Amino acid sequence: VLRDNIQGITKPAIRRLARRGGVKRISGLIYEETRGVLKVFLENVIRDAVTYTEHAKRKTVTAMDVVYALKRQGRTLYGFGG
């Protein structure tokens, strides 16, 4: 059974990311907080992406929509065109 699907961002993946972040030891409560943090971050990006999507009268979310959403949040991404 599924659990709202946010749980697919599993503990070991977060652990791996933290390791890339240089983290040696991690409290067990960190994981849910990280998930919440991600949802907020994601919501804002996707929200803007869809706004761009809606402006173009398109039903398919493009990479450019993401790029613009990221730029306006001060999180410029290189490598996907534009």
Binding site: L17, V23, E33, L42, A63
Partner: protein, 98 residues
């Protein structure tokens, strides 16, 4: 049985993933999360695969940076264990109020 002390393997994992650049989150659950959230704003939306890859890149870079700041806050607090309050502090200082 042979047994390594706590931290040695963690450090090896750090070195491994910091040497490489491959994505650490699974593609499918990420797609499903994205689709669910987007669905909550507008129905029957589609996504380009590279858009999802872009979102993943952004998400993971954001998360490592937050964990880096978290780690500095922990070390600042004379700890090696990260806590929610460390994340909350780092995000508050960047102004990621939420």
């Amino acid at each position: 049985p042979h047994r390594y002390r706590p931290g040695t393997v963690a450090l090896r994992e750090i070195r491994r993933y910091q040497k490489s650049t491959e994505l650490l989150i699974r593609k499918l659950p990420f797609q499903r999360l994205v689709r669910e959230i987007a669905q909550d704003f507008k129905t029957d939306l589609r996504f380009q695969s590279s858009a999802v890859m872009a979102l993943q890149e952004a998400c993971e870079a954001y998360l490592v940076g937050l964990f880096e700041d978290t780690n500095l806050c922990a070390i600042h607090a004379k700890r090696v264990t990260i806590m929610p309050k460390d994340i909350q502090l780092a995000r508050r200082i960047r102004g990621e109020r939420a």
